[PDB]
Every structure is written in C-alpha cells, then in structure tokens.
C-alpha cells in the first residue's frame, strides 16, 4: 500500500546513510551492503584478470537456464566458500545485465528465482555450517576485500 511504500523508502534511505557512517539499519542491511561491496570488488578483480565473456555464452530463452546451471555447478564442484558465493552473485548479476542488453528483460525475474532456489537448496547447508551470513559480514564488512587488495598496492 501507500504506507508500506513510504516506510520501505524511509528504511532504504536510512540504511544507506547509516552505512555511510559505519552503522547499519539491521543485520540484514549489513549483509546486503557487505555483499554489494564484495560484488564490486569481485567484478574489479575479475575484469583486471579476464575479458568479459558474457556475450560468448550466447544467452537465449531456450539456453538461459542450462547456461546458468552449468556455470554454477562448475563454480561449486570443488567445494564452497564465501568468495565463490560472491562469484555466484556476480555471475547472476552479469547474467541479468546481459539479458536486458539482449532485450530479454523477462529473464531477470527468472534468473533471480534460479539464484534464490540455488541459495535455498544448495548453499544454505554450508552457510549454516560456517557461521551464517553474520560471519560473512565479519569477513567482508567495511569493504574488507577491497582494502586487503589496497594494502598490497
């Protein structure tokens, strides 16, 4: 409704301005902001190493799911870790941007669902065995990865 949208807008803005000062609106908001930052950083490290190969997947409606499935299964074959989970979000992101680029906007909503389902059915086990997302925030909050790279520079 109108009250819900105003509330949601107040919450989003306050969450942002709090995180700008090192605070957080809520534990969820802190996870979201650490994850965005880790995404930015993973994409920066990826693009410095390798070329953007998204176009080379040749996304189509018929192939979109199997493409997603195969990249993600290969990403987690050897095991799971926070960095690989960040890679999974980034790939989902690159996958959605490509879908819009190639005028298949509707795949964004489907890619989002494939991602949530994979999180529920295949990553949650490991996530709960490894401290939950609060532990992720402990490792990646305050833009930790980007700083760990800025140190070596």
């Amino acid at each position: 409704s109108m009250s819900q949208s105003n509330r949601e807008l107040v919450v989003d803005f306050l969450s942002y301005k709090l995180s700008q000062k090192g605070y957080s609106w809520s534990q969820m908001a802190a996870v979201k902001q650490a994850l965005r930052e880790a995404g930015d950083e993973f994409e920066l490290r990826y693009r410095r190493a390798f070329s953007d190969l998204t176009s080379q997947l040749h996304i189509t409606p018929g192939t979109a799911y199997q493409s997603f499935e195969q990249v993600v299964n290969e990403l987690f074959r050897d095991g799971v870790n926070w960095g690989r989970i960040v890679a999974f979000f980034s790939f989902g992101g690159a996958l959605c941007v490509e879908s819009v680029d190639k005028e298949m906007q509707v795949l964004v909503s489907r890619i989002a669902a494939w991602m949530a389902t994979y999180l529920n059915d295949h990553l949650e086990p490991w996530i709960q065995e490894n401290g939950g997302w609060d532990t992720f925030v402990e490792l990646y909050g305050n833009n930790a990865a980007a700083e760990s790279r800025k140190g070596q520079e």
Partner: peptide
Amino acid sequence: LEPNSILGQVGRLLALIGDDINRR
C-alpha cells in the same frame, strides 16, 4: 576441462577469482 565448454570454463574462472577474493 573440455575446450568447447565455454560454460565450464566461465565457472572455473569464477572459481579462481572467488578463491582470490576469499584470501585475506
């Protein structure tokens, strides 16, 4: 592994960078 599996390749490249970002 297989050279035509651009999809497996991308997964492995993601893994490599994922491992790198996971190092502290």
